[PDB]
Design a protein around this nucleic acid. Structure first.
Lengths: 93, 268, 256, 94, 253, 254
DNA sequence: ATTTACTACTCGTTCTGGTGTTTCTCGT
DNA sequence: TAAACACCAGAACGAGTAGTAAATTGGGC
């Protein structure tokens, strides 16, 4: 069981509702919760499926160097960048 | 896309709703009130949702809550359970038939009651005692416990009512009865088929719950009763949440049930 | 003893009686007695006082789709009365009593008693051969292309509709849908047993009827068709006495 | 050391920069990182001080019932609500 | 509001920046590139930032990074350390403590001996001076090096060793500065500006650089530098290098 | 030998330290000519610049305007150990304790310290004289002084002096943490040298500005000190002073 | 009676590029 | 001179609401 955070943008209400079934919508499109590994990977399947033309990023707590990892879906001005194993995000103009 | 219930242990304990209408807005559990403020409730995170008077559930709400494997309990004064709704489908037939056979055989019913006894007090039950004789013994030990705890915490005790201290006890146990029933359903057993308790629609729920209720859950009701807060309901509910978390109750409920029925020496 | 289906309304208590409020606020008074089970179709919103009252009188609440087409949630989950569950169980734990009930299911399905000296799995063979025969026969009656089990989509949609009222009947009767006799191991085993008895009477010949046409909405118009059937033919109301008669074949005294 | 998440709205660029010193800005005003307790409460002082007329919420991982806790700063349509110890957020209409 | 550096152990080990200008936007470390895309770097999260050729730092950048306690290292070919910038001093008590031990060769001997004992596991042989101990340490290093070439099967590559050790030298120096000691005042190594850095590092250098840097050299992957860096990164994480460096220094003294 | 570069990029052309501007080059620097380069705000260092400076042993210090504030310096903790141990040796032995502290006194006020009064006793004499100076200066500029707006000017002014003082210590190659009069604090040695020349120009300037009473006393004191350090060449005399300060120990310097 | 999809419409914050002002959160 | 913040307009995007129209629904043993 580790912390989970999902940020959705330009996503249909179908998914915005689905995420509210397990996670807590603290802000507009921002969901926070504490699930297990197995639960995290089903939410990602919900996101990958229900999100249309929208960009979503999911960050969860792990035992990596940073203490967390994150994967993205769809296009956004902020895309991940690999710095020798360490993953950061750059701002594309 | 399909919706499936998550494991019980990964879920939050309970939630209490009191004044609002419960509808579904885009496939999500919401609680709208008179003023029209909305509150989103993760049903797939809660193992049981308690419904206090003043609540109005929608058809979609009860349907959704079933799909996610969340139990809905309509409760009375001090959280006493009234009605309950859940998936009619569910439970492998084997675990039901397994539970059934244990109740249909009078040799195997005693045996399984004995383990409940053994888990209850820590010591094996005395021999040459029938079910109703064992119930007599357990009943006497229960009132003994109640009396001593009242002396330990220093409360005025004369009886156990079902109509301030008793309000705390009943509320606390009602919390335990909630998650216990929710565990039995998720595990795949029937809450109606009991061993120690019979004739009642929640016999099996009481059986499992009474085993561990006095360990942590009940002595806390007494603690709060001495404190006598303006919010006895809220501080009892908040206490039980912490208990279920610390004692890992949800994670402990499923193996407890399976260990009890295992006493029948019959293949699970 | 009867049952009621309520739709499009709020279920509250305003004078110590079950009432059905409308958009306009029209009421419909329902006697708490005489009702053993209340079916809630989509569009319904139950109040706490209603649920409180229904519990006090011992009435079962089942959330159903249109005309009981699909079951979503049932009150008193797991089962209502302990004895009737054990009653169904004893019939299932003894394979001698299992045969008896299968035999009655057989007799009720086709109208004739099963041939003697046949085990459960021999009977499955016999009933299976006549079912594919029926399907073929119905295919000739409506004149559709049949090769095995568009047509299958209609039948499958139709049977799913039937499973609703059947399961809803088992719940209303007070029994468990997981404990079956012909079908076993699955959580809806008992539902399949009763359903296959009457599927061919009306439900299947209708799936074929729509199958002969080819509308753009075969799924929903089969469901809406079954909906009309269950209402007009009062199927569920006929289901409950059938179930208790089926279990009565075990020659064991039934509960109060 | 536990996971940390900060969501800022209508906040001056001063704070949006400060948060980028320790946390990772994955989305507009959304910062994620893994810090300790004392470092977390230093971030909250940065927020409470540098945020002008803006609403910010900070969520961190714990061993509570939810598995996490969250604090808010400033006014917003989504305010926290306590349900018998349990903290959720409600949507206020105009 | 004031900004203070967080503990070293809570931080990420290393980051490598190349080909771009490093400015400060709204009070934050950013890296703008040729195309003009920007990249924000949590400078208060990193214990050491390596600056490869092609980088152009701004005045505000170096100033900001110092206050947050991040070490800036200008690195050469295959990650060799060139220059370093950091807070212009750190603690007087910890420094004088280090100094006094270096001014007395009787107390210098003690510290050289413990470094020896911690390196190989056995106490150093008696009746041998500081300059005599170097022969023993020198011989075991070349002996070690030869043995490892046999274990992994290489012909005795240097690019991998130098890159790995240089990474360790970065965080080591960053640890010494954060602790409050001087990287210039060493005991085993002398004459060089990173004397104390080399002293602490080689105690534990053979522990990982050898079992893993050598492994990478024989596999001979494309772009050997990055696969050495990510390797060292995992080590610092798994072996909890940063959290153990500070108590190691005080234990040595 | 030190130089201050501002408003420009620091690159290397033709194997020499250069400062590139929009106009294209403003200052050509022979690599063997500067012993320490101070970088004022507006500067952007290149990698090639830093690479060259390490090879030749040149110290880079990021300073504010005219060295008013130090932020980051190359060669952290100290460059060569000997210059540090030299500083260290002077502070750790109490025989060598009187040393420059008496001389700092002599350099501060102009008169030699009493021949047999200890450090904390010397602290008392200077302590009595500093409060006297403060009061005396306050009477000439005609400001209201009763103890230690005016204090805001002095505190701002001393902070400016602490900048160039530390910048001198770094350029000299010594550690600002190892002090003689002040101890235990990370800028102890900075305070020692600063108090020697603090009253000469820096304090008389704070009082002067305090008398006019501006709305923004903090900023106009620093810019004044900024101008002082440049015109009066404060930094250039600081470095030989520090080496002169440490020379009082009668111990061989590096 | 409830719920969802679809359609404008308002509102909100993020973001960019334009000037003008600064070289800076102080004590030892 | 260079680098960087504060401030002020603008465009540009997505969240949110009110209104109208369509369903009562993602299945098979």
């Amino acid at each position: 069981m580790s912390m989970l955070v999902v940020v959705t943008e330009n996503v249909p209400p179908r998914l915005r509702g689905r995420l509210a079934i397990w996670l807590l919508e603290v802000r507009a499109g921002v969901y926070v919760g504490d699930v297990s590994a197995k639960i995290r990977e089903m939410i990602w399947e919900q996101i990958a499926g229900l999100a249309e033309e929208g960009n979503v990023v999911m960050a969860w707590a792990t035992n990596t160097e940073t203490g967390f990892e994150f994967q993205t879906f769809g296009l956004n001005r902020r895309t991940p960048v690999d710095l020798d194993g360490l993953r950061l995000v750059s701002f594309l103009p | 896309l399909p919706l499936n219930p998550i494991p019980l242990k990964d879920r939050v304990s309970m939630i209490f709703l009191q004044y609002g209408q419960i509808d579904v807005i885009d496939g999500a559990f919401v609680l709208i009130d008179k003023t029209g403020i909305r509150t989103h409730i993760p049903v797939g995170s809660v193992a049981c949702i308690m419904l206090e008077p003043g609540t109005r559930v929608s058809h979609a709400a009860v349907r959704l809550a079933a799909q996610v494997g969340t139990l809905l309990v309509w409760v009375g004064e001090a959280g006493v359970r009234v009605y309950a709704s859940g998936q009619p489908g569910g439970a492998r037939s084997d675990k039901l038939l397994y539970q059934a056979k244990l109740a249909l055989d009078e040799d195997l019913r005693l045996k399984v009651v004995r383990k409940m006894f053994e888990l209850r007090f820590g010591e094996p039950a005395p021999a040459r005692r029938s079910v109703e004789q064992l119930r007599g013994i357990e009943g006497s030990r229960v009132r003994a416990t109640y009396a001593l705890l009242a002396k330990q915490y220093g409360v005025t005790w004369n009886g156990r009512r079902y109509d301030t201290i008793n309000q705390c006890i009943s509320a606390a146990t009602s919390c335990l009865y909630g998650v216990t029933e929710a565990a039995i359903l998720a595990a795949g057993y029937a809450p109606a088929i009991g061993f120690v308790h019979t004739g009642k629609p929640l016999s099996f729920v009481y059986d499992i719950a009474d085993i561990i209720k006095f360990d942590t859950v009940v002595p806390k009701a007494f603690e709060i009763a001495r404190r006598n807060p303006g919010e006895p309901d809220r501080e009892v509910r908040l206490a039980c949440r912490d208990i279920f978390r610390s004692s890992k109750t949800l994670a402990k409920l499923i193996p407890l049930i399976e260990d009890v029925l295992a006493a029948g020496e019959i293949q699970p």
